[PDB]
């Protein structure tokens, strides 16, 4: 069963931080124009942080000081390299940065 990635719509005023919770290497992805994958961070650009909670299975994926260009689509995925190449991806969530 894949990880969850919530909230599905994250409404944040620009300048505030935004944190998704990924509950499941663990990658945080942003879907670009041309709908291709960009890796923002991994567990284990300074504005995209991943914090493993004491829970161990939950992770906070945070945008520090969200800008309007940060608006887009995001997800998390867990990769197992072997035996058998496997990825379990979350459903896609949207970051909606609004004007202050």
């Amino acid at each position: 069963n894949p990880p969850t990635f919530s909230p599905a719509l994250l409404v944040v005023t620009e300048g505030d931080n935004a944190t998704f919770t990924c509950s499941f290497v663990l990658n945080w992805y942003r879907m670009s124009p041309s709908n291709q994958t960009d890796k923002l961070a991994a567990f284990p650009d300074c504005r995209f942080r991943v914090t493993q909670l004491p829970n161990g299975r939950d992770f906070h994926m945070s945008v520090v000081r969200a800008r309007r260009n940060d608006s887009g689509t995001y997800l998390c995925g867990a990769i197992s390299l072997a035996p058998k190449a496997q990825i379990k991806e979350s459903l896609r969530a949207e970051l909606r940065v609004t004007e202050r």
Epitope: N27, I79, P83, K84, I87
Partner: antibody
Framework: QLQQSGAELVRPGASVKLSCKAL????IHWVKQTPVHGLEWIGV????????VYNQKFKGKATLTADKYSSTAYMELSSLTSEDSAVYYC?????????????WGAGTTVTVS | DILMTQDELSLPVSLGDQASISCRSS???????????LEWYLQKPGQSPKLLIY???NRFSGVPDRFSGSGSGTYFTLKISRLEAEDLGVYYC?????????FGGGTKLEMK
């Protein structure tokens, strides 16, 4: 397709780096072939994360890397001996597929003098 | 490590004959997810290996149905009914259920 680099002619004790360009999510595997030892799985890299898993028999002998801004994977062979003279294939495994190696490179031959 | 042992090194045939290639694994090869990643590859002379059968018995896309795979536990078999010239080469079994992945030593199907 997987396009492999040209034949290598190298001396004992040296190192050589082979490349594999993916044309046209996956993991990239390397396989050695010799008449006496057959086909041997060397290891795998996931280019997106850089993660690797090695066959312990090839730890130290082979180092797998992959570029981030080109679809190229590499295998560096070190401490070369006549036992390393062989054909080396790169092959691909799709994420979340039911099978392994449906696409293979043509192989790169290494000859240790 | 799992050792994959093929029963015969060579099989001399005539075109149109039946061929059977068997492979014994030293341990069972069921992945933790329940699938058995037992595969058969054909390496035609001077070519790279090509995937014929995956998950024991499934033909890869485009592989003709004269090829069939069966087996379970530690014994797996590829059968070629009425073999054609394009079938000549070396057949290798392969397990990808447990790291490190391992291949059989090959069985060469050649003209008798």
């Amino acid at each position: 397709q997987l396009q492999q680099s040209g034949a290598e002619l190298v001396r004992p004790g040296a190192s050589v780096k082979l490349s594999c360009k993916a044309l046209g999510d996956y993991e990239i595997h390397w396989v050695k072939q010799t008449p006496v030892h057959g086909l041997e799985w060397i290891g795998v890299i996931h280019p997106g994360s850089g993660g690797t898993v090695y066959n312990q028999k090839f730890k130290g002998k082979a180092t797998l890397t992959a570029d981030k801004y080109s679809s190229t994977a590499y295998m560096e062979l070190s401490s070369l001996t006549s036992e390393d003279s062989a054909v080396y294939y790169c092959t691909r495994e799709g994420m979340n597929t039911d099978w392994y190696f449906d696409v293979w490179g043509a192989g790169t031959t290494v000859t240790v003098s | 490590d799992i050792l994959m042992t093929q029963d015969e090194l060579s099989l001399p045939v005539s075109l149109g004959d039946q061929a059977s290639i068997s492979c014994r694994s030293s341990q069972t090869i069921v992945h933790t997810n329940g699938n058995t990643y037992l595969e058969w590859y054909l390496q035609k002379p001077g070519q790279s290996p090509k995937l014929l059968i995956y998950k024991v018995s499934n033909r890869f896309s485009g592989v003709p149905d004269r090829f069939s795979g069966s087996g379970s536990g530690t014994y797996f078999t590829l059968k070629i009914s009425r073999l054609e010239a394009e079938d000549l080469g070396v057949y290798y079994c392969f397990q990808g259920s447990h790291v490190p992945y391992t291949f059989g030593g090959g069985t060469k199907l050649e003209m008798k």
